[PDB]
Design a protein around this ligand. Structure first.
Ligand code: MG
Ligand code: MG
Ligand code: MG
Ligand code: MG
Ligand code: MG
Ligand code: MG
Ligand code: MG
Ligand code: MG
Ligand code: MG
Ligand code: MG
Ligand code: MG
Ligand code: MG
Ligand code: MG
Ligand code: MG
Ligand code: MG
Ligand code: MG
Ligand code: MG
Ligand code: MG
Ligand code: MG
Ligand code: MG
Ligand code: ZN
Lengths: 94, 175, 38, 136, 58, 130, 135
RNA sequence: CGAUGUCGGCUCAUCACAUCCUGGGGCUGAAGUAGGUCCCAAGGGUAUGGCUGUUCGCCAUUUAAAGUGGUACGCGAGCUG
RNA sequence: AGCCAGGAUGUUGGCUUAGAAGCAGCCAUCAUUUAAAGAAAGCGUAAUAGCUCACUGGUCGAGUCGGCCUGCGCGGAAGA
């Protein structure tokens, strides 16, 4: 079971994306269902270690944002072309 | 570190005198004085020597462990001394001692002689063995190294001066 | 001494040691394993 | 000797080589040799690395080459002036971008795979990495 | 490799076009100054160096 | 041998000491393969393989195991006193076997305490049922 | 001390060719070993290897204790073959009986390190399997 | 390009070290003799002739060795031609 | 890590060779006393013999190990 702590993104775009990836975060977005897609930022270290297990991409994940829980499932992950880092993750609401 | 944690006990009849980083140990064999690195904090607490860092000296535990070991061997040398046993090999290789100057003959065209330093003695129980006694471990090892250097033992017959404890590899002239 | 730019352990006995700022491989067993970076 | 059997055109521009790679993920086999560095691998280097890694795996498992050199590289003979047209195609390269998976492997232990990929990478102009197939 | 030996011009007797090649394991020393380009000399007369070593071995 | 195998090992030794009444002590400071194998062979010829030469009298494994029953063995942990358990028979005759082994070419480090199973002294008890 | 078991079949007295100098590393005699071996084999059948332990002492009186005949040649007789196997898993050599393995092991049960002879019966089963005889 | 005289020889050299000899050392598939290879070292020393304009080369006979390069492929307001 | 111990039996596995006993090579590459012992990881012989390695116990008692990313840094690095 994976509970991922995330923050709602204050600002989006390429520049902000690179800024977080420098500052030890990485973006992601939850989408699906009737609620509009939620743009989140994640702590790359914890998420890296979390997805290390092959069940991470199968089970149903939960994300705590602002003290709210969201049940999702990993849709698609963006990885660095040559580094063991994550760029961005697509989550689909459970 | 781990070595510096081991406190070296002083037996009875063990005169330990501290002077900043200068430490002198006197016993029944002899007296030895060594100055320690500024980093090393040496304390004598009523029956033992203990070693620690001085703050602000980075390589403190490494220097501390070295100093601990040196003082340990100082204790050993002053109390029961150090022995180095060298053994010759080969035909005619022989050793004699004239007081404090070893007459080695090793198949050279000249007779070899080593002058000992002050703190050492030597003796030759047999023709080719030499047991040499001393206090300072570094110096006694140095003198054994010198007598061995006079003819380092070859690896083809072990021939030449070798440490008695030494085990020498022997190669074979493949044809 | 093998003067290499790429010093390694060659057996189970070879030991890497830095001396005076030079990497070396001293083999307690095999003399041919004695390497020096340079 | 990977080399196009036929090609539409016989010589090509120098071109540029910027950007990151596409064949980035270990897709066919289980283990992969991913290029950190940006360069060009002549078919010679590709074949040397392939031979080395196959010999390391003792002809067990299967080996995927995810780069095929299709760009012809031209050189003038020695001691010829600069004009007089483009030089002759002397070999073929596969432009690499950082992250291109040069090779892939399966049927071997991960340990033998790492060892074979290292014996192969020691033949390449560009610095590489060992990566594994990952679920999603 | 060195200057062309023989009889030519000052270019011939000044520029290093002869590439004389010796097969040390046998000592067969033969190579040309014929082509004005050093690599052409090297390869073209390497052909006949292989020829001379073939004759000797044979 | 992590926590799991440690738990099966402690289970095995607890079950052995609960099933058996009598035991003997040993300490192989100079215990030869001959002595160890002859004792184990004696166990095998007397009865099944249940009797062992296991050497596990640690300060934190057997001492933690003993509180179950026969708590008198907790003090025995120091000075490396290993046990050899005996399930069947009332006061089996194999106690003197370790004394004979100590007599025949041993450094006499076992001290043959006997762990006072009948609450006797540490001296040898030559009286056994016959 | 200095006990190494190196012998041949009982049929050949004075095994000078095969072992020779190995048995005579020291200046010890070669006739004493042969006479002791013959004296021991007078009570058994001839033609079988017999392992013996050797303790040479400085009083010039070597002490020797014999063992059972080797299980290799014992199973050789049991199977009735002269060549064991080469490269076994490909083509099978012969079939072996559990009861006959037990009978083979029961005679050396006395000398062996085993209470339930079934254990070393299985061990010789594995021995013949590793040689190339499937039980 | 209102001139920077090219090959080679002679005389004179000076520097580099990727050392030919001598010097110190490690491994050797180094028994010794003699080698192989690598490392430190530029203090000194480092052929004479036959042929050829030759540098080079081949050959003859020496030598501890007959080093590889820079210097306007050193040196014609120094010589030769 | 080191100090104290061991590291057995089948078996000397069958071969081809001149002999192969783990060490020349190949296939089999199991099981047995089990704390634990690979038909063998190394050194040795003419072949053994012989010294070792893996793995088990014993002593002292707080850290140990080897991967990843990275900052700075070391060698590789010889010319007039
Ligand atoms: Mg921008
Ligand atoms: Mg170099
Ligand atoms: Mg463009
Ligand atoms: Mg592209
Ligand atoms: Mg020119
Ligand atoms: Mg001009
Ligand atoms: Mg002018
Ligand atoms: Mg130099
Ligand atoms: Mg040299
Ligand atoms: Mg000079
Ligand atoms: Mg100078
Ligand atoms: Mg000078
Ligand atoms: Mg004339
Ligand atoms: Mg030039
Ligand atoms: Mg000039
Ligand atoms: Mg010059
Ligand atoms: Mg001139
Ligand atoms: Mg003229
Ligand atoms: Mg340990
Ligand atoms: Mg650098
Ligand atoms: Zn080594």
């Amino acid at each position: 079971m994976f509970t991922i702590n995330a923050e709602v993104r204050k600002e989006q775009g390429k520049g902000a994306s690179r800024r977080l990836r420098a500052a030890n975060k990485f973006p992601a977005i939850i989408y699906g269902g009737k609620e509009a897609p939620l743009a989140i930022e994640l702590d790359h270290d914890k998420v890296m270690n979390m997805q290390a297990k092959a069940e991470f991409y199968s089970e149903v994940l939960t994300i705590v944002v602002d003290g709210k829980e969201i049940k999702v499932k990993a849709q698609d992950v963006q990885r660095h072309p040559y580094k063991p880092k994550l760029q961005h993750i697509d989550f689909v609401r459970a | 570190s781990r070595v510096a944690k081991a406190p070296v006990v002083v037996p009875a009849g063990v005169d330990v005198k501290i002077n900043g980083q200068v430490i002198t140990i006197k016993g029944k064999n002899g007296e030895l004085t060594r100055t320690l690195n500024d980093a090393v904090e040496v304390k004598h607490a009523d029956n033992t020597l203990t070693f620690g860092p001085r703050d602000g000296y980075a390589d403190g535990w490494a220097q501390a462990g070295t100093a601990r070991a040196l003082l340990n061997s100082m204790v050993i040398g002053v109390t029961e001394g150090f022995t180095k046993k060298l053994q010759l090999v080969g035909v005619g290789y022989r050793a004699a001692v004239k007081g404090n100057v070893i007459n080695l003959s090793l198949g050279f065209s000249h007779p070899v002689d080593h002058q000992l330093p002050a703190g050492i003695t030597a003796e030759c129980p047999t023709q080719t063995e030499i047991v040499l006694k001393g206090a300072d471990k570094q110096v006694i090892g140095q003198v054994a190294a010198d007598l061995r250097a006079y003819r380092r033992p070859e690896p083809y017959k072990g021939k030449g001066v070798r440490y008695a404890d030494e085990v020498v590899r022997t190669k074979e002239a493949k044809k | 001494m093998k003067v290499r730019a790429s010093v390694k352990k060659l057996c189970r006995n070879c030991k890497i040691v830095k001396r005076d700022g030079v990497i070396r491989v001293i083999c307690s067993a095999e003399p041919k394993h004695k390497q020096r970076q340079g | 000797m990977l080399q196009p059997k036929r090609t539409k055109f016989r010589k090509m521009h120098k071109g540029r080589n910027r950007g990151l790679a596409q064949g980035t993920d270990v897709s066919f086999g289980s283990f992969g040799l991913k290029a950190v560095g940006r360069g060009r691998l002549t078919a010679r280097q590709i074949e040397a690395a392939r031979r080395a890694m196959t010999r390391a795996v003792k002809r067990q498992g299967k080996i995927w080459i995810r780069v095929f050199p299709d760009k012809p590289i031209t050189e003038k003979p020695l001691a010829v002036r600069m004009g007089k047209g483009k030089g002759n195609v002397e070999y073929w390269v596969a432009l690499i971008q950082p992250g291109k998976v040069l090779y892939e492997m399966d049927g071997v232990p991960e340990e033998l795979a790492r060892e074979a990929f290292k014996l192969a990478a020691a033949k390449l102009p560009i610095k590489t990495t060992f990566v594994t197939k990952t679920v999603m | 490799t060195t200057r062309s030996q023989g009889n030519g011009g000052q270019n011939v007797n000044k520029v290093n076009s002869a590439v004389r090649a010796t097969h040390l394991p046998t000592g067969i020393s033969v190579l040309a100054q014929d082509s004005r380009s050093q690599l052409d000399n090297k390869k073209l007369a390497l052909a006949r160096l292989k020829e001379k070593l073939a004759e000797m071995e044979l | 041998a992590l926590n799991l195998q440690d738990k099966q090992a402690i289970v095995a030794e607890v079950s052995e000491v609960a099933k058996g009444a009598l035991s003997a002590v040993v300490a192989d400071s100079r215990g030869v393969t001959v002595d160890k194998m002859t004792e184990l062979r004696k166990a095998g010829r007397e009865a099944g393989v249940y009797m062992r030469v296991v050497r596990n009298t640690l300060l934190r494994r057997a001492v933690e195991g003993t509180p179950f029953e026969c708590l008198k063995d907790a003090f025995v942990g120091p000075t490396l006193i290993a046990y050899s358990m005996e399930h069947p028979g009332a006061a089996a005759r194999l106690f003197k076997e370790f004394a004979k082994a100590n007599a025949k070419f041993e450094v006499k480090a076992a001290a043959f305490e006997g762990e006072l199973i009948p609450a006797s002294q540490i001296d040898r008890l030559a009286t056994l049922p016959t | 001390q200095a006990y190494v078991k190196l012998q041949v079949a009982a049929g050949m007295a004075n095994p000078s060719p095969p072992v020779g100098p190995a048995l005579g590393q020291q200046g010890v005699n070669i006739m004493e070993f042969c006479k002791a071996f013959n004296a021991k084999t007078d009570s058994i059948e001839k033609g079988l290897p017999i392992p013996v332990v050797i303790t040479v002492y400085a009083d010039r009186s070597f002490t020797f204790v014999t063992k059972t005949p080797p299980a290799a040649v014992l199973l050789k007789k049991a199977a009735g073959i002269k060549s064991g196997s080469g490269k076994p898993n490909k083509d099978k050599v012969g079939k072996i009986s559990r009861a006959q393995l037990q009978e083979i092991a029961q005679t050396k049960a006395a000398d062996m390190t085993g209470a339930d002879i079934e254990a070393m019966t299985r061990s010789i089963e594995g021995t013949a399997r590793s040689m190339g005889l499937v039980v």
